[PDB]
Each structure stands twice: as C-alpha cells, then as structure tokens.
C-alpha cells in the first residue's frame, strides 16, 4: 500500500510514514538506509528486493487567527507549511488527528507560502496589516455581513516624487507635533 500514510514494521524496523518507489543505488549487501543526521530514510523490501523511501506522515502545526471574542465568534484555521490539497483529502478521508472540523466552502481555501488557510476568503485589495499570518499575508475582521478576509499587506500609500532638473518645493508653513515613545 504505497503513497499512503501507513504504519510499517519492516523486518523489525517499525515506524510511521509514506512509502513509494525510489531510484536509489543500494548495494546487494545493503539492507537499511539513512541520511546525514542518522534517521532511517530508505528500506529494502525483504520479499520484493525493491527500494522504498520513508517520509514524515503529515507533520505541520495548526494556528488559529481570530478577532476579539467580544466582537465575533468566527475563527480561521492555519495549517502551517502543508500543501492545501493534502489536508483536503485527509479531511475527506477523516484521518486527521484534530477532531474539530472547520467547514470548507471551496471559497475558504488559500494556498499560502506559510501553508493552507481555511475559513477566510481572498480579497485582492490591499490594506494595512492587522493580524500577521506570514509571507506577506494579513487578515482582519471586515464587513462585507461580517467575516474574516485575507489579503496581501499594503506597504503604504503609493506616492511618486516630482523630481526635475530645476524644480523644488520649500515649505511655506510648518506644524508642531508632540509624539510619544515608551
């Protein structure tokens, strides 16, 4: 059963992960496989004499972004650093360790460089960052009638200077500002 998270007990080497075909160069006497950090990487099939690779199962980390509970109860779920199709099939097969299930409408799907975001919808507009998610993506609570929206952070107002060969601007007036700093 390849290309599936499966508990393996190969010749006494027991572990968890996904196994598939490989293009290793195992010598005939070779039985196990490893890497620089001494973690079992490849195993030879004792009854097939083929080479299989060992992978983490689905490792990631769930982070929840939310506004104040006194404001709203709606929440959004981040699955850190996982392709968002993999969580989709795992949810549909009901093999995810998290038992809480955030509903998937198809419009709340977001493949982000930081992972897959569920429960928020993409708006192609640009706003100032409110809740940092990562990879230049920020979410906030915004009315449509209210929901959680995800957008690329606006670096600021787009402004262009009036540089020229012989044109200058001199302030004819001035203001007094009292800032604060802690």
């Amino acid at each position: 059963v390849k290309n599936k998270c499966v508990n393996f007990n190969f010749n006494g080497l027991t572990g968890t992960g996904v196994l598939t075909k490989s293009n290793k160069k195992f010598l005939p006497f070779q039985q196990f496989g490893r890497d620089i950090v001494d973690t079992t990487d490849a195993v030879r099939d004792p009854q097939t004499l083929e080479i299989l690779d060992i992978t983490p199962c689905s490792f990631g980390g769930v982070s929840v972004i939310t506004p104040g509970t006194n404001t709203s109860n709606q929440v959004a779920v981040l699955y850190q650093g996982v392709n968002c199709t993999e969580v989709s099939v795992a949810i549909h097969a009901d093999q995810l360790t998290p038992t809480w299930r955030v509903y998937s409408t198809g419009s709340n799907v977001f493949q982000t460089r930081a992972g897959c975001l569920i429960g928020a919808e993409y708006v192609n507009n640009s706003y100032e960052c409110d809740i940092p998610i990562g990879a230049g993506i920020c979410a906030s609570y915004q009315t449509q009638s209210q929901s959680i929206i995800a957008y690329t952070m606006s670096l600021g107002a787009e402004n262009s200077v009036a540089y020229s060969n012989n044109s200058i601007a001199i302030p004819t007036n001035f203001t007094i500002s009292v800032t604060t700093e802690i």
Binding site: N3, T14, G15, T16, V18, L19, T20, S22, N23, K24, G33, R34, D35, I36, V37, D38, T39, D41, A42, D53, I54, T55, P56, S58, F59, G60, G61, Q80, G81, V82, N83, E86, R113, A114, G115, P132, I133, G134, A135, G136, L155, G156, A157, E158, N159, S160, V161, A162, Y163, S164, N165, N166, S167, I168, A169, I170, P171
Partner: protein
C-alpha cells in the same frame, strides 16, 4: 549587518515522544515544561519579525524613481531596481542573493518530495521527520526589496526632507552641495568639479561590485549566522541518536521490546536526556536572538542616521567624512553603501 534569522517552532511533544501514547503520558508528569519552550520560540519569532520591520519599514509612503535617470551625471543603475529582472532587484542585490546559500529556505512546502528524494533525504526532510519545522518570515524577500527601493528613491530625489516631513524634491546637484556644506566645505568646489566627482563616484560604484564578486567571503556575517543556525539544528536532530544511558536510542524499539514497568526507567532516561538537550538548544537560540536583536537595533539606527540625512559622528557611517548611504536588502540582513 545581519537583521534576522530563521524562525523555528520546535514541538517538544512529538519531538521527544514520536507518536507514543505512553511516552506522552510520562511527559505529562513533567508539568508545563513544554509550554515554556513553545512560548519562548514563538516570542523569538515575534522579535525577529519586529526587528526586520523596525530596520526597514521606516517610511510610510512607498516612492518610485522618475522614469528618466539622469541625476546630474551620477549613475545609479547598479543600485536601482532592474525592470527587466522579474524580481525587481538591484544588480548588487542579485550578487548578495547569489553569494548566500540557505540550507533551509522555509517557504518550500517540501512535503511531497521527501518520498521522492530518490537519494538520501536532505537536512530539511530530516528535520521534518522528528518534530522540527521552520516558520517562513512574514516579510517576503520580495516586497522588502520594494522597501529598499522606496528608501533609495526618497534619498536621491528629495535629499533628507522625506525622513522628517513631507517629501520635498531637491535636484541631486545641490543635494550634494548641501552634503558638502554639512561637513565643512563650501558648495563652490562641487559646482566646479561636478564632472570629476561624478566620475569618481561611478568608478567607486563599479569597483565595489568587483570587490564583492572576487572576494572569498565578504558576506561572512550573514553566512556565519546561517551556518550557526544550521549547525545548532543539526546537533539538535543528531541528539536523538544518543541512548543517554538506556538500552537503545529508539523509543519505539524499547516500547515493543520490554514491558511497560521496566521500560519505564529507560524511557524516563530518554526524556531526561532529550528534554535537557532541547533546553540547551532553546537557551542558545535565546542568546543568538538577543545578539541579533542588538545588531538589528544598531542597523536600524545606522540606517535612520546615515541613510536619512548626514551624520556628524565620525566613523559611524563608514571611514572618512560621511556624505550619504544607500541601503540594499540581503538574505536575513541588510547591506549598506556608505
């Protein structure tokens, strides 16, 4: 000056007890000795994000250079963003990005090709195996170059006015006149030897590119930061290979071989070893984070003083009587052009 380093979110639970219910139960007896580590690591990530934000996002308005680039004979193509390049980076920025090699990029989503590694799996797949992941930074290497571009465009088309108030355009010639006046030489010499100073500046700009190209390692500070982080990560991963004084270094082997009440001592020994190793890693990461925070504060104040105006303190903005500085983005750091 380095600005930040990779953000990690080690999870002690299955870093120490790989999918072992009894090991998790044993770990539960050690109290909240894990929440401390998770909170410390997430705090370190937050401070690093804050460091890069302080050291770069200094101007609220993003500016762009005028389409024509003739600033009184001065040449800025080597530092201005390249429209032909799809990443919109300076030629020097390209050299900085190519002379730095990151073992762990972070924004890779490398799951799905570890099974397809064919050869021996690499460092990142190894980390993914045993409960260690890298959290990608908020400010992508892309728009940060946009920030540096905005800062550079502000400092050559408006002098230093835009750092105190509204951006007021000043042509580059009398801007240099004022930078000469701020050090103690009258603008007349610049207005006589404009051609000579322009040629000298162009020659220096051209030579610094060759200096960065031909040097063995001038970006050694950023490379050292990356190498130290990778080495700490590698030794943390390798520490799971130590029996720590028990029968074997494989928790699952110990579980499947001995009874619970006798393998209990061995798994407790493994917990005491692995958790303490994670403690050393976390403390060392804290020290490195404090050091890089101090360096990033220094970089922020250096940028605010030298780049956004003329600094009167000697040797602070490079050796000699300072005139101006030009910022350039680097992997996990910044590069200055005094």
């Amino acid at each position: 000056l380095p600005v930040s380093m990779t953000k990690t979110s080690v999870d002690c639970t299955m870093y120490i007890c790989g999918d072992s219910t009894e090991c998790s139960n044993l770990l539960l007896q050690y109290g909240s000795f894990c929440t401390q580590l998770k909170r410390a690591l997430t705090g370190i990530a937050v401070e690093q994000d804050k460091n890069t934000q302080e050291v770069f996002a200094q101007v609220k308005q993003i500016y762009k250079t005028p389409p024509i680039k003739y600033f009184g004979g001065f040449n800025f193509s080597q530092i201005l963003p390249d429209p032909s390049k799809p990443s919109k980076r300076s030629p020097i920025e390209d050299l900085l990005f190519n002379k730095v090699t990151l073992a762990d990029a972070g924004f890779i989503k490398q799951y799905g090709d570890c099974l397809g590694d064919i050869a021996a799996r690499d460092l990142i797949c190894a980390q993914k195996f045993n409960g260690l992941t890298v959290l990608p930074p908020l400010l992508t290497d892309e728009m940060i170059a946009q920030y540096t571009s905005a800062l550079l465009a502000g400092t050559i088309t408006s002098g230093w006015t835009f750092g105190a108030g509204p951006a007021l355009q000043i042509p580059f010639p009398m801007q240099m006149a004022y930078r000469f006046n701020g050090i103690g030489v009258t603008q007349n010499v610049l207005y006589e030897n404009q051609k000579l100073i322009a040629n000298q500046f162009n020659s220096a700009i051209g030579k610094i590119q060759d200096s960065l190209f031909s040097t063995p390692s001038a970006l050694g500070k950023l490379q050292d930061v990356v190498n130290h982080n990778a080495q700490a990560l590698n030794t943390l991963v390798k520490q799971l290979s130590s029996k720590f004084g028990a029968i074997s270094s494989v928790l699952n082997d110990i579980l499947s071989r001995l009874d619970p009440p006798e393998a209990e001592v061995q798994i407790d020994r493994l917990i005491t070893g692995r958790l303490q190793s994670l403690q050393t890693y976390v403390t060392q990461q804290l020290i490195r984070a404090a050091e890089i925070r101090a360096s990033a504060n220094l970089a922020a104040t250096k940028m605010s003083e030298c780049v956004l105006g003329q600094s009167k303190r000697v040797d602070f903005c490079g050796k000699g009587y300072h005139l101006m500085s030009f910022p350039q983005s680097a992997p996990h750091g910044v590069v200055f052009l005094h």
